[PDB]
Design a protein around this ligand. Structure first.
Ligand SMILES: [Ca+2]
Ligand SMILES: [Ca+2]
Ligand SMILES: [Ca+2]
Ligand SMILES: [Ca+2]
Ligand SMILES: [Ca+2]
Ligand SMILES: [Ca+2]
Ligand SMILES: [Ca+2]
Length: 455
């Protein structure tokens, strides 16, 4: 029997689990399983000049290629500057995660391949299409534009015009669509929605995520969690990308339109890829109840939306800052700095010595294991407010309570609450194993009382 606060943390940390179960009658695939699914055609570019990176060049077509007329595409036109600008941003977002480089220029001798972008006008061509890297027309992608279909004319962060570019380019890199009029009912796995992969034809609503409301459209601009794993499986991860301390979200330093927020109404949808350093997910500008998880491969509910933000497999984000709402913050095994913000927050540091800030409001610092805060690597609550904040240990004690004493007696369950009214430093020591010495330590900036502990 643990507290309600712990249940909420545990519940959310498992809310998006994948693999070995059925979801909507369909098998749930893990990220790894999906990466095999998205690259099942076996097609990809080869490294001809041997140097561990695929060097592709691309051209914005100026004139129709030889035999163009026979394609049935109608009037040929070239990319406008807007499209070229957006195309470069999408290409960039792929280069960021996998070892693939893209350079604007004519087909050269030392390239591994060449790509072309162009527009057509005959709707019978479809909204847009690309070719796999093992076909005669490899590297080509085409975009419909006419009076009746206008989405490719104004692509921009967040709209389908931008996702199309990202989607089609993914296809030219070798990624297949999640499955082979069809609907989500025909998908092979459960996570085949736009919430996990930009290659999917189905909306996030099929998997329960909530990004927007009828009338408005919100689309991920860059590769999502499954896309990232599928492309790195193909070309290897790019560990040089943002390998220095990076901030995502508000006050962002990632220099990418899709990782950037400047307003409380912003609708973020992204998957973090990062090379290393001490990193932060800053969601301070939002006022909605958020739920942030710093676990690699996990999802978070940000800025009033659900399952819209995730962290790629093999990535470690160190810090997270909540917003004005009553948030849940979950750390990982690294030393995390977690700031709650205003509102009533539930913070779970995890393993390692964590720096925790509750901010204003009545906050709860939850602990699920003795190994979460030991004397060697002890947590520190920089702003504990006695009489308002609580230190929840129920997941450990299971509500058996603690025995507050002045000195350890050797009986398991003994706890000592100290305070140095000069440094304003307080601490909680506990002997869970009853080995006569403290095996759990939690220090704080601010006096802690015995009634501020929930055990
Ligand atoms: Ca190469
Ligand atoms: Ca970084
Ligand atoms: Ca890092
Ligand atoms: Ca908050
Ligand atoms: Ca708070
Ligand atoms: Ca931690
Ligand atoms: Ca900890």
């Amino acid at each position: 029997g643990t507290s309600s606060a712990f249940t909420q943390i545990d519940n959310f940390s498992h809310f998006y689990d994948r693999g070995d179960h059925l979801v909507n009658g369909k098998p749930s695939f893990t990220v790894d399983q999906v990466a095999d699914q998205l690259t099942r055609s076996g097609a990809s570019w080869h490294d001809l000049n041997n140097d561990g990176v695929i060097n592709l060049t691309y051209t914005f077509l100026t004139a129709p290629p030889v035999g163009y007329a026979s394609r049935g595409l109608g009037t040929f036109s070239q990319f406008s500057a807007l499209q070229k600008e957006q195309a470069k941003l999408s290409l960039e977002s792929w280069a960021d995660v996998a070892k693939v480089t893209f350079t604007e220029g004519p087909a050269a001798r030392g390239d591994d391949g060449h790509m072309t972008f162009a527009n057509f006008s005959a709707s019978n061509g479809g909204a847009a299409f690309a070719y796999l890297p093992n076909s005669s027309r490899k590297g080509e992608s085409w975009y419909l534009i006419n009076k009746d279909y206008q989405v490719n004319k104004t692509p921009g962060e967040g709209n389908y015009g931008r996702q199309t570019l990202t989607h089609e380019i993914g296809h030219t890199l070798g990624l297949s669509h999640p499955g082979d009029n069809p609907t989500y009912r025909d998908a092979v796995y459960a996570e085949d929605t736009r919430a996990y992969s930009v290659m999917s034809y189905w909306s996030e609503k099929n998997t329960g995520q909530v990004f927007t409301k009828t009338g408005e459209g919100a689309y991920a601009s860059a590769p999502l969690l499954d896309d990232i794993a599928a492309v790195q499986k193909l070309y290897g991860a790019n560990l040089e990308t943002r390998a220095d301390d990076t901030v995502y979200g508000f006050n962002s330093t990632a220099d990418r339109d899709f990782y950037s927020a400047t307003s409380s109404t912003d609708k973020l949808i992204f998957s973090v890829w990062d090379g290393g350093g001490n990193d932060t997910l800053d969601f301070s500008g939002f006022s909605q109840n958020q739920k942030i998880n710093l676990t690699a491969g996990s999802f978070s509910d940000v800025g009033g939306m659900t399952g819209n933000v995730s962290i790629a497999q093999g990535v470690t984000i160190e810090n997270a800052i909540g917003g004005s709402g009553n948030d849940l913050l979950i750390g990982n095994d690294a030393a995390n700095v977690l700031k709650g913000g205003a509102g009533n927050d539930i913070i779970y540091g995890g393993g390692g010595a964590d720096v925790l800030w509750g901010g204003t409001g009545s906050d709860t610092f939850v602990f699920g294991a003795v190994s979460d805060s030991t004397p060697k690597a002890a947590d520190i609550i920089k702003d504990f407010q006695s009489g308002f904040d609580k230190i929840d240990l129920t997941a450990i004690t299971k509500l058996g309570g603690l025995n507050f004493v002045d000195a350890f007696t050797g009986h398991a369950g003994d706890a000592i609450v100290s305070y140095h009214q000069a440094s304003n430093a307080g601490s909680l020591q506990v002997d869970f194993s009853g080995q006569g010495v403290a095996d759990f330590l939690v220090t704080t900036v601010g006096q802690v009382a015995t009634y501020d502990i929930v055990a």
